[PDB]
Amino acid sequence: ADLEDNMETLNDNLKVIEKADNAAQVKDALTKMAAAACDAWSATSPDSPEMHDFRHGFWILIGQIHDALHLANEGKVKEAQAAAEQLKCTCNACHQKYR
Amino acid sequence: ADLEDNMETLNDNLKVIEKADNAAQVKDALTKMAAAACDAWSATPPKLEDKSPDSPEMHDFRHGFWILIGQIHDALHLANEGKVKEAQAAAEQLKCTCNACHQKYR
Amino acid sequence: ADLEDNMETLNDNLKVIEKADNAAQVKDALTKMAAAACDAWSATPPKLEDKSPDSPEMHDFRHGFWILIGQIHDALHLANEGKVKEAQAAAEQLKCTCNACHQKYR
Amino acid sequence: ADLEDNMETLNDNLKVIEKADNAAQVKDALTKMAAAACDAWSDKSPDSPEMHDFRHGFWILIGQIHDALHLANEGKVKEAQAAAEQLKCTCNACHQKYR
Amino acid sequence: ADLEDNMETLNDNLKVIEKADNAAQVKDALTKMAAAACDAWSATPPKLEDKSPDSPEMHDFRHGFWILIGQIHDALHLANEGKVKEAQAAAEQLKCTCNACHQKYR
Amino acid sequence: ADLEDNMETLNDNLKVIEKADNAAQVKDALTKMAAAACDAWSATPPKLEDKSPDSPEMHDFRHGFWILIGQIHDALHLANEGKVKEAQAAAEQLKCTCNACHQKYR
Amino acid sequence: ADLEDNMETLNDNLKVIEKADNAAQVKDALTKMAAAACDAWSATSPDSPEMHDFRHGFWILIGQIHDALHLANEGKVKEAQAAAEQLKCTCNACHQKYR
Amino acid sequence: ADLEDNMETLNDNLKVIEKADNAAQVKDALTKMAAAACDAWSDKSPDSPEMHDFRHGFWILIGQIHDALHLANEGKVKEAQAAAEQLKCTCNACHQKYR
Ligand code: HEC
Ligand code: HEC
Ligand code: HEC
Ligand code: HEC
Ligand code: HEC
Ligand code: HEC
Ligand code: HEC
Ligand code: HEC
Ligand SMILES: [Ca+2]
Ligand SMILES: [Ca+2]
Ligand SMILES: [Ca+2]
Ligand SMILES: [Ca+2]
Ligand SMILES: [Ca+2]
Ligand SMILES: [Ca+2]
Ligand SMILES: [Ca+2]
Ligand SMILES: [Ca+2]
Ligand SMILES: [Ca+2]
Ligand SMILES: [Ca+2]
Ligand SMILES: [Ca+2]
Ligand SMILES: [Ca+2]
Ligand SMILES: [Ca+2]
Ligand SMILES: [Ca+2]
Q1: What role does it play (chains B, C, E, F)?
Q2: Do D50 and C23 touch (CB under 8 A)?
Q3: Contact check, Cβ <8 Å, D38/E69
C-alpha cells in the first residue's frame, strides 16, 4: 500500500482499540496495524540515511505492536490497550522528525 | 500477492543472494524477501483452512513469519554495514525456518 | 566433557534463559552454552562413527555447530546491550538448529 | 541529591509546565527538570548492562529536556509545552521496566 | 557543590585519565567529571553575578557545559567499548571546551 | 592547494552544514572539510616558515589538524546514521579547534 | 584449557600449516586452531570492557580460521596457507594491546 | 592527486621505512605515507556500502600510520619500524577485497 493507507490503517485501528470491548476486537485491530507497519517497513539513489532512519522507526513500531498483540493473546486486555496508547510515543516521534 | 507467489519471491531472492557479487544486489533481494514475508504473515495456508484463525496452529504459523522477518531484518542490517559475506550467511540460515514451517504446515 | 554432557548443558542453560529475570543470568547461561557448543564442534556422534572424519556428513555435522555458535555469539551481543527480551528470543530460535541437526544425526 | 527527590522535582515541574502561561515559567521549570535529570544520570553490579541501560535512559531524557528548553528559549512556548508532555514516554518506558 | 570544587573535580580527573592504565579507571574518572559538569550547569560564576539569569552570557555559559557533558558522554562510550586510547584522547579534546569557557567567563 | 583556500573550504562548508536541511548535504560538506583538512596537514603556515619542520610548534600545528580530522570523522558518522541535528552540532564544536589553532599560529 | 595451551596450540599449528605438504595436514592443524580459539573465546566483576574487547579478538580469529578451513576443504591448499599467514595480523594485534 | 599515485607513495615509502637507519627517514617516510592515505580517504554508487567500507579501510590505515609516527617521534625507531610492517595487513585486507 501507499503510505497514506498505512497511516489510515494505523490511525483507524488505534481508535478501534481505544473503543474496543473484548479481546477479539483488540487482536484484530493490532493485526491490521502490524501488517500496515510491515508493509510501510518495505518499499521502493542507493538509499539515504533518512530512509534508513525512517525504516527503523517502523521496525520499532512493529516490535511494539507485536508485544501488544502478545498481551492480547495472553488475555490481558487492559494491558494491551495501554500499550496501544504507548505506541503514540513512536508515532509522534516520527511525525515530529519527518513531517 | 498470493501465498504461493510470496514463496516464489522468497525462493528466487534466496538464490539471488547466493550468487550475488555486490552488496546492492543483496539488499535489493533481501528487501523483496521482507516484503514477501510481510505479505505472507497474514496468509492462511491450505492445511489450516479448517482451523480457527485464533487456533494455536494459526498462532504458530504466524509466529514462523514473525521469526523469518526478524532474520531478514538482521541480515539486512549486515548488508548495510557492507558485511556481504555475513549477510549471505544469515540468509542461508533462513532455510532452517523455511523448513521448520514447511515440515508442519506445507 | 562428553557430547551427551554438552547437550545437557545446552538444554539446561536454554531453560535458564527462558526463566531468567535479569541480564547477568542470561549472559552466564549463554556463555555456558557457547563453551558447550565449542566442545561439541569436535565431537563425533554415534550415527556417524562408521563415516570418514572428512565425510560430507561429518562436514555437515560440524557446520551445524558452527551455525549454533554464531547464533549464541549474536544472542550474547544482545544481552550485553542490555536487550534481555531480544536475547531470550534469539535464544529460543536456536531450537530450530538444535532440531535440524537432531533430525539428521541424533 | 536523593533519587526520590529527583523524580519528585521531575514530576512536579512537569505539572508546572502543563499549568504555565508565559515562557519564563516553562524555561524555569524545565531548567529544574534538567538539573534533577543530570543528577539522576549517575543489589545489581556497578558495571551491569541494567545500569548501562538505566543511565542511557536519563541520557535520552536530558536530550529531550534540552530540546524543549531550546524551543522555550526561542519563544515557541506552545511547542515547548508539547515537547514536555511527550517526555512522559521516556518516564514510563523506564518505569515499565525498572519501577 | 562549590562551582570551584566542581572545577577541582574536573581538573583532578582529567589528570587521572591521562595516566590511567585500564578502562575501569577511565570510566570512573569520566563519571566523576560528568557529575561535576552536571552540578556546574546550574551555577553562576562570579563574573556574571550582576547579570540576569536570562542574559545571553548565562545562556552561553550554560551551553558550554552542555557541550562539555556531551563530550564526556562520547568519551565514556569509547571507554565502554574498551577503546582506552581513544577515550583518553577524547578526554584531552575536552581541554578546548575548558579553555574556551575560561577565556570568556573565569 | 593554497593553505588559505583549504581554510576557505573549511569555512564555507562549516556554514553550508549550519543551514543544510537533509543529511546528504551534511555528508557532502563534511567530506569536503575532510579533504581540506587532509591537504592542510602538510602545509607550513607563514608564522612558522622560519622554524624547523621538526619544531615543537610544527608538531602542535600538525596535531591540531589530526584532532580536526577526527572530529570531522565523528561528525560524518553521526551523519550516516541520519542524526542530522547531532552531526550539525558536532560540526559546530569543530569551531573550538579552528579557534585554538588560529589563536596560536594565524 | 589454560590460555597458555590455547597459544601453544595456535602457535604449533600455525607452524605445521607453514610446513605442511598436503591438504589433510592443513585441515587438521586449522581444526586444532579453531577449537583452541573457540575455547579461548569462552572462560570464567560483571565483566570489564577489556574482557569484551579481548573476547572479540578471538571471535575475529575464529571467523578467519573458519574461512581458511573452507579454502582447504575446497582443495585450494596454497590459498589456505596464505590465510594462515594472514592470521598473524590478528595474533599480533592482540599481543600488542594486551601483552 | 591520483589514487594510483597514492598507492605508489604508500608502497615506496613503506620500503624506505624497511631500509631506514635513523628516526628522521622513518618520520619523513611515514609523514609522506600519511598524506597519500588522507588523499585516498576521499561503476558503484557514491552512497554504496562498498564505499563506506572502502573509506573506512583508509580510516584504519591512517590511525595506524599516526601511531607509528607517534613512536617515531618518541625515538622508538625500531618499534616504529615494526608498526609499519604490520600495516601490510590492512593493505592486503583491502587488496584481497577491492584490488
Ligand atoms: C515514521 C517512521 C512514522 C511512524 C512510526 C508513524 N507515522 Fe504516521 N505518518 C508518517 C509520515 C511521513 C506521514 C506523512 C506522509 C503522508 O503524506 O501521508 C504520516 C502521516 C500520518 C497521518 C496522516 C496522513 C494521511 O493519510 O493524510 C496519520 C493519521 C498518521 N500518520 C497516523 C499514525 C499513527 C496512528 C501512528 C502510530 C500508531 C503513525 N502514524 C506512525 C510517518 C510515520
Ligand atoms: C511458514 C511459517 C512458512 C515459512 C516461514 C516459509 N514458508 Fe514456504 N511455504 C509455506 C507453506 C504453507 C507453503 C505451501 C503454499 C501452498 O499454498 O501450496 C509454502 C510453500 C513454499 C514453496 C512452494 C510453493 C509452490 O510452488 O507450491 C516454496 C518454494 C517455499 N515455500 C519457499 C520458502 C522459502 C525459501 C522460505 C524461507 C526462506 C519459506 N518458504 C518460508 C510456509 C512457509
Ligand atoms: C548437531 C549439529 C547438533 C546440534 C546443533 C545440537 N545437537 Fe543436541 N544432539 C546432537 C546429537 C548427535 C545428539 C545425540 C548424542 C548421543 O550420543 O546420544 C544430541 C543429543 C541431544 C540431547 C539428548 C542427550 C541425551 O540425553 O541423550 C539433548 C537434550 C540435546 N541434544 C539438546 C540440544 C539443544 C538444546 C541444542 C541447541 C540449543 C542442541 N542439542 C543442538 C546433535 C546436535
Ligand atoms: C529511568 C531511566 C527513569 C526515567 C527516564 C524516569 N524515571 Fe521516574 N522513576 C524511575 C525509578 C527507578 C523510580 C523508582 C524510584 C523510587 O525509589 O520509587 C522512579 C520513580 C518515580 C516517581 C515516584 C517516586 C516517589 O517518590 O514515589 C515519580 C513521580 C517519577 N519517577 C516521575 C518521573 C517523571 C515525571 C519522569 C519523566 C518526565 C521520570 N520519572 C522518568 C526511573 C525513571
Ligand atoms: C564554562 C562553560 C566552563 C567550562 C566548560 C569549564 N569551566 Fe572551569 N571554570 C569556569 C569558571 C567560571 C571558573 C571560575 C570559578 C570561580 O568561582 O572563580 C572555572 C574555574 C576552573 C578552575 C580553577 C578552579 C579553582 O579551584 O579555582 C579549574 C582548574 C577549572 N575551571 C578547570 C576546568 C576544566 C579542567 C574544564 C574542562 C574539562 C573546565 N574547567 C570547564 C567555567 C568553566
Ligand atoms: C591549525 C591547526 C588550524 C586549524 C585546526 C584550523 N586552522 Fe584555519 N587557519 C590556520 C592558519 C595558520 C591560518 C592562516 C593561513 C595563512 O596563510 O595566513 C588559518 C586561516 C584560516 C582562515 C582565513 C582564511 C583566508 O582565506 O585568509 C579561515 C577562515 C580559517 N582558517 C578557518 C578555519 C576553520 C573554519 C577551521 C575549523 C573548522 C580552521 N580554520 C581550522 C590554521 C588552522
Ligand atoms: C588476544 C585476543 C590474542 C590473540 C587473538 C592471540 N593471542 Fe597469543 N597470546 C595472547 C595473550 C594475552 C598471551 C599472553 C598470555 C600468557 O601468559 O600466556 C598470548 C601468548 C601467546 C604466546 C606465548 C604464551 C605462552 O604460552 O607462554 C604465543 C606463542 C602466542 N600467544 C601465539 C599466538 C598465535 C600464533 C596467534 C594467532 C594465530 C595468537 N597467539 C593469537 C593473546 C592473544
Ligand atoms: C583500501 C582500503 C586499500 C588500502 C588500505 C590499501 N590499498 Fe593499495 N590499493 C587499493 C586499491 C583499490 C588498489 C587498486 C588501484 C589500481 O588502480 O590499481 C590498490 C593498489 C595498490 C598498488 C598497485 C597500484 C599500481 O600502480 O599498480 C600498490 C603498490 C598498493 N596498492 C600498495 C598499498 C600499500 C603498500 C598499502 C598499505 C601500506 C595499501 N596499498 C593499502 C586499495 C587499498
Ligand atoms: Ca484508503
Ligand atoms: Ca462499545
Ligand atoms: Ca496478499
Ligand atoms: Ca503448488
Ligand atoms: Ca570434550
Ligand atoms: Ca542418551
Ligand atoms: Ca546525586
Ligand atoms: Ca572548597
Ligand atoms: Ca599510573
Ligand atoms: Ca586563492
Ligand atoms: Ca537552506
Ligand atoms: Ca600444554
Ligand atoms: Ca615436508
Ligand atoms: Ca585526491
Answers
A1: Electron-transport protein of unknown function.
A2: yes
A3: yes
